[PDB]
Design a protein around this ligand. Sequence first.
Ligand code: CDL
Ligand code: PLX
Ligand code: PLX
Ligand code: PLX
Ligand code: PEE
Ligand code: ADP
Lengths: 121, 459, 56, 107, 40, 42, 320, 347
Amino acid sequence: TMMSGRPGRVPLQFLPNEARSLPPPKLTDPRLVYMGFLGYCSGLIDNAIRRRPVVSAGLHRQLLYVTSFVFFGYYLLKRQDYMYALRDHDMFAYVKSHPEDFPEKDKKTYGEILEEFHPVR
Amino acid sequence: MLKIIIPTTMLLPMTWMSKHNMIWINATVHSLLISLISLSLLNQLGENSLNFSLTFFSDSLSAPLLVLTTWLLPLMLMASQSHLSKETTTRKKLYITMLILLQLFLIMTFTATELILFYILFEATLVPTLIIITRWGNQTERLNAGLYFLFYTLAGSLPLLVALVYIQNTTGSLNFLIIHYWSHPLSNSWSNIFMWLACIMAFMVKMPLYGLHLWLPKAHVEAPIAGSMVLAAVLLKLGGYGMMRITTILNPLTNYMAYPFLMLSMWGMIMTSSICLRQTDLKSLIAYSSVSHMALVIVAIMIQTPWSFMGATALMIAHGLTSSMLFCLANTNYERVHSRTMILARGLQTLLPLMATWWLVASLTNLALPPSINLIGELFIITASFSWSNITIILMGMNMMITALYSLYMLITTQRGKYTHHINNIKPSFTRENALMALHILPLLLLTLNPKMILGPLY
Amino acid sequence: NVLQIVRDHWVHILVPVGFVFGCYLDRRSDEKLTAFRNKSLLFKRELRPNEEVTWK
Amino acid sequence: PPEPTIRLQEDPDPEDENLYEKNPDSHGYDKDPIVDLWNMRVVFFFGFSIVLVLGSTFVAYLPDYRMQEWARREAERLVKYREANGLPLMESNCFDPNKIQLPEDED
Amino acid sequence: ARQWQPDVEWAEQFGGAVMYPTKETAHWKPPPWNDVDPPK
Amino acid sequence: PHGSPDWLKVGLTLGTSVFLWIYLIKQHKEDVLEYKRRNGLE
Amino acid sequence: LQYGPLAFVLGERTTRKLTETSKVITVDGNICSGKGRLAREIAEKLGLRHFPEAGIHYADSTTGDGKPLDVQLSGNCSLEKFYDDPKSNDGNSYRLQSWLYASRLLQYADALEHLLSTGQGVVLERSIYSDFVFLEAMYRQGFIRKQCVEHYNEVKKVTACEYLPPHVVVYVDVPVPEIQSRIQKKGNPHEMKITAAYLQDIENAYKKTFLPEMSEKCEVLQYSAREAEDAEKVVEDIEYLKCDKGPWPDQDDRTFHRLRMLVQNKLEVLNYTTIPVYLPEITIGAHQSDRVFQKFTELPGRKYSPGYNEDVGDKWIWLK
Amino acid sequence: MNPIIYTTLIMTVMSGTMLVMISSHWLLIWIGFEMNLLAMIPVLMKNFNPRATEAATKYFLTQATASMMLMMAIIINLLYSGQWTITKMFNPVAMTMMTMALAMKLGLSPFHFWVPEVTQGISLQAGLLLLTWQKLAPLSVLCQISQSINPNLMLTMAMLSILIGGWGGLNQTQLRKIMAYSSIAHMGWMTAVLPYNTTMTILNLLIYITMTLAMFMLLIHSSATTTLSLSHTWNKMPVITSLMMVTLLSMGGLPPLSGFMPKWMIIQEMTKNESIIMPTLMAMTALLNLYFYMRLAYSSSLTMFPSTNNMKMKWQFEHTKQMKLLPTMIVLSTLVLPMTPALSSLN
Ligand SMILES: CCCCCCCCCCCCCCCCCC(=O)OC[C@H](COP(=O)([O-])OCC(O)COP(=O)([O-])OC[C@@H](COC(=O)CCCCCCCCCCCCCCCCC)OC(=O)CCCCCCCCCCCCCCCCC)OC(=O)CCCCCCCCCCCCCCCCC
Ligand SMILES: CCCCCCCCCCCCCCCCC[C@@H](O)O[C@H](CO[C@H](O)CCCCCCCCCCCCCCC)COP(=O)(O)OCC[N+](C)(C)C
Ligand SMILES: CCCCCCCCCCCCCCCCC[C@@H](O)O[C@H](CO[C@H](O)CCCCCCCCCCCCCCC)COP(=O)(O)OCC[N+](C)(C)C
Ligand SMILES: CCCCCCCCCCCCCCCCC[C@@H](O)O[C@H](CO[C@H](O)CCCCCCCCCCCCCCC)COP(=O)(O)OCC[N+](C)(C)C
Ligand SMILES: CCCCCCCC/C=C\CCCCCCCC(=O)O[C@H](COC(=O)CCCCCCC/C=C/CCCCCCCC)COP(=O)(O)OCCN
Ligand SMILES: Nc1ncnc2c1ncn2[C@@H]1O[C@H](COP(=O)(O)OP(=O)(O)O)[C@@H](O)[C@H]1O
């Protein structure tokens, strides 16, 4: 697809202004919960490497791990949703503007289609 | 489907936060509860399927496999309790974690509605098994065994992935429902021939097909008892389930692409069976018998008839239960004798009579004595093969005779005759071992009362 | 003794809570696919006087 | 050759331990008698009493969602109607040819 | 009654300069432990 | 060695977590309101 | 703020700490000589910090509580068994020699860290440099093999090539018959078993190999039993001489920073003492290794980092 | 060296890379490469010994030759079109020269010979920097001029790199050479997808950088540079060996780990361009990398090798310096497959 050269694109914008017309991901998004789970696993591994009681060594450190992962994951999800929206928008616009490349197929019914039959013997 | 998946995931924190002396009790109890919950999947329809969501669906082909998978976990825990006595708490928890992760991967693999999702979980099942084999295996060959079990598998499954993505660029979907409803014939072409081979070989290598089966004896004789149980009972059936699912897009090429494999199976089942006649290791004998039964399942799937599919499903379930029981019996001998050689411990019927009864029932079930579901599957496959070609009976008939021979051979060498004089450490059977055998054998004889549960979606 | 056996047997609630949460999760998925509820040609039906949806 | 013929400092191979020696009525589950007894009890109760009996009864009484008796009733009504009106039971064509448009060959 | 674990003879196959020694490589020597070569 | 709970680091970590959570919740609310205004929902 | 690159960048420079009296000093002599008293008196008079000679359980005295651990958890060797049966079947002799060399290396690192962190000098008994004499004697008496001394040489090379040799070497000279009389007077039944050959080879190694090589890069003060009684003249000799031939005047602030980062982080000091060279005297099988390591973990205060042990009385583990 | 000087040199390396990444003039890209090479040499030679000096001179000669040919390609491109902007290359000879120069800068086959020797000669920190950061600039330049590459040459060098890495890793007992050959194979995987999709190249680079950072930091924590030295780690810190085993399984492309994400995606992309044979061969050849990863896992954590007595002293001490972001690197290199569709962020 290569939307790097897409016209009207700001060189270093993480989320453009037009991205604000899309619904934001919910705070209970399953992907956000998975990001928080990744942060929790990072905290547990940090406890294990430093040779501390894994489950209950640093609660502030684990909370910061989870919170940072959730924050970055929320913004990443917003950007990903925006990029897929752009892809679909361009696809539909291109199909609309080139009708001779996407003709409407003349609908046919299985009663008037001759399909070959292969017996299983 | 999440009503089964979420408790299986919750098994992990329950295992890790358990007391040091209460891991086995809690794991066994909650695995049994999960099996009871999964029993509800057996209520199937004659219509399409139990399409829970966009990601998971259940069928009367998937439901018995799921029930077997959930039932095998408590038995594996009971079998592993003994030889893991002198192990540290953390490593025991890691062992239980590997078993739980394997169960989770299998559960999801059977119910996945997408071919790519199925491939990912079908490969994810490899890592726990490899760790179990190469970490808690006993002999030094385990490392080599693990390597075989890995690379064979991967050598078959890397082409499949390619084919899969290729298919999704042509049809536009890998969802099984859409794939079934929008199926189109495969024209006889070299490209189509290689696509067929790519779609078939990954499932052939895990059955295993004769000539591609060299990994299985190594892996099964080198694995710990729980690893052997899960490998023989469930992991072999992944190839059968995959071939049953994927053959819908391979017609009418299968009409003539199946010839090399059919021969390789029909002759192969003879060879492996004859191999069982001259074997000095119990586990090796049981593994080769598994190869013979799976060759019959391969023939059933390649024939592609309703009776063939019914027989293949029934035989898969029956073989899973029977081979798991046989491996457990062999291990209960090994933990007393520490040899794994058939002719060392002899005349055990005199010293352990109830275990001899368990041996007899397991041998009878492996021998396909009617009306066991083993014989139901075997007879349906044989009838379908006879319709395919009347000459097949010859080979099929021969296999039957040979099977009985080696089965009774294994029963006579270990249980009958005179006891070995210098072996004086054969203690009475524990309640745990007897309960393990009973929990293996009662479901088989119960299932013979309602065979429709294990006859698949073409019943 | 309560508040002492809890510290050892709180583990036994994890799997049943997972089961209840899984059932609740399954119900949520069902709501999303209601695109054809009471719209199939086979089960198309007129609603009862005090019925809002045919299934849940 | 003053070598000790010892390759390294290694523990001797321990002898296997008999569970019956320190505890008759051992049940083979654990070396702790209480934990062993309760492991036996939970295994037996949740395997034989709960799953094997109640689950088998549940499977036996599963409602007919496969619709076998429904198909039997439908077939009975169809056979009655067709024998009453002289129709020839099952028909050779699954779909009536009035709705199939075959292609003209004109060869 | 004991699980097999690698011993010195098993551990020595990974102590060479390379795996799969050949006639040409037979004279190769592993690098020093501190990766320092005497000034000579 | 022999060390007490460093109250400075604990306070900074907890404050950072709380600030991030409040900022995230405020940002989500503003996003929802702006999306509704742009699409004329509410 | 523990020492590191940031402390060096902002304020920490160790060159201003030196005050002409740092002068790491090592005192050497044969078995049961008076060198310990002389070193203690030198430290007392010069204001330096004395380091008692490193034994089997020197590392135990620096970690956790200073109490020694069990022999099978720390050292796996004994001096009394070496005195009773030096030609041991189990190769204990070289195990003891290697463990003592590692302990001396750790103690030298600790002394260097103290000197570089405070500027106060330290006084030591037999250091890593003088450690080799025992190995040589043990070889000439047939107690150890040649492979053992080769392994010792490799380890000593890769470890001792990274430290500054002592400024002053103080050697006490005592005759072998007089020292044998001293052993007789000591009364330790295990020490009464040392043959005169062992002492003679110790002295021969000291004189022929260790003294002249230290005379080429340090200042050496060879003293006898009588003239070591008065430490006043010893201290006068210590102050009178000036160090101008050793590598210490060559050192600068950057090299001091590198060596100070090396002397802390004891795991880097001890890194090459466990090179994968499989000699039967020191290599340990996997099963015994696992058992002993699990046993070590069981001991209180060893399961979790020093401040994270509830059994030891540690508090606020969750918030640390 | 002095910490101030070391920080300045590291910042100069990063600034040269960023100058390559942000400039639109060929001369400025060349200047960025020159600045990076100039500041890189002392970092390799930080711990002075003959091996480090030899590695530094080998690296200098290779990079100087590559930069000279890059300047030649720029001058030929300017000759045939008065252009300085980094765009379409306007000349086949100049583009072949540029591709070869960037291939030698990256270490793609047949210009792979310097990577194992340079990595073995330098320490583990210098190897970490060399194998992670020193790939950004040439790959960014290749991404900018992807539409002009001759696909035959690029695919030939990529397949050769995969084969050479797989075969050369089988023979190694030194961990740094194992990392070098793994890097060569991953570079081949990255460059095999440039003609079709640069987003796939960037995604593969990110995943590889995460995995390499995790493995190098694990090797630094357990200060081992050989197989036998790494076989002793279980007797001091078994957690490190278990984490390294999972990371090695991920590096082999085994699902459901993170290392499966690039190959999968790349294969898919190639299939979309009617390319079937090459991805098949690529996966078959990555099996070799997986084999020697598995051998390392066997010797490291899945079995217990003999130990030494002096290890007991090491039981009494803890690591003084803890590397931050190591747990995050491990988690990111093992458990990010469910987040695969995030690649649309054009990472
Ligand atoms: C689809 C997947 C779904 C599941 C996801 C799976 C992954 C999830 C977790 C990922 C990682 C995060 C956590 C792991 C950190 C490691 C720490 C550790 O080692 O454990 C010690 C610790 C216990 O030990 P300890 O007494 O504290 O201190 C001992 C020392 O730590 C050290 O003890 P030691 O030194 O004495 O023992 C040494 C031992 C220690 O070695 C280790 O244990 C290291 C752990 C392995 C490496 C981790 C890899 C990183 C993640 C990759 C995961 C791969 C998944 C892909 C599938 C492939 C499967 C391999 O090493 C060995 O013995 C060497 C032998 C090696 C054996 C074979 C190696 C196989 C490794 C593969 C493991 C993969 C699954 C691990 C599951 C979790 C394991 C803890 O474990 C824990 O208790 C924590 C586990 C998690 C806590 C859960 C608590 C939450 C419950 C709250 C309520 C329930 C939530 C629901 C909410 C609703 C309720 C209302
Ligand atoms: C090792 C343990 C067992 C592993 C599993 C073995 C199973 C795999 C066996 C592969 C199945 C057969 C593959 C191709 C079958 C197609 C039929 C064809 O081969 O027969 C004739 C083809 O003739 C010749 O076979 C041409 C090919 C000859 C070259 C192939 C090599 C022959 C033996 C190689 C065996 C090596 C297998 C192991 C590889 C490592 C038919 O003549 P023709 O009408 O014209 O072609 C029809 C096909 N069309 C329509 C597409 C054109
Ligand atoms: C030991 C000495 C003897 C003592 C005992 C003496 C008494 C003998 C009786 C024992 C067997 C004799 C046969 C008598 C059969 C009567 C019961 C039979 O009729 O019920 C069957 C029912 O059997 C069950 O359906 C099969 C059992 C279910 C098996 C599931 C296994 C349980 C879970 C375990 C884990 C799963 C592992 C395997 C995974 C695949 C078939 O019933 P069906 O005519 O049809 O319809 C039931 C009634 N309806 C019409 C209202 C519906
Ligand atoms: C292991 C997975 C990779 C981890 C990567 C490291 C994670 C930490 C990095 C923290 C976020 C860095 C983002 C920087 C903030 C603002 C960035 C913004 O200014 O730049 C935009 C660019 O933003 C970044 O590209 C997005 C980075 C997000 C990376 C996530 C994708 C990972 C793949 C899926 C795996 C799941 C990972 C989830 C757990 C972290 C505009 O780019 P543009 O100048 O116009 O075009 C140049 C790039 N082109 C040429 C490719 C088109
Ligand atoms: C246990 C070990 C088993 C190893 C695996 C054996 C199976 C090998 C199957 C073939 C491998 C490649 C499969 C290709 C993936 C399917 C995609 C596909 O079918 O597309 C074909 C492409 O088909 C191919 O290109 C396949 C060519 C083969 C190249 C790789 C050779 C691998 C070895 C071949 C011989 C061995 C096969 C059987 C082995 C038996 C077991 C040992 C059509 O391509 P297009 O050009 O787009 O359409 C044509 C119209 N323009
Ligand atoms: N490298 C070594 N090998 C064997 N024994 C040693 C070694 N180093 C010190 N010792 C023992 O340490 C003991 C006390 O040290 P020593 O200096 O001889 O007497 P003291 O310290 O009481 O003056 C002696 O019994 C000596 O044998």
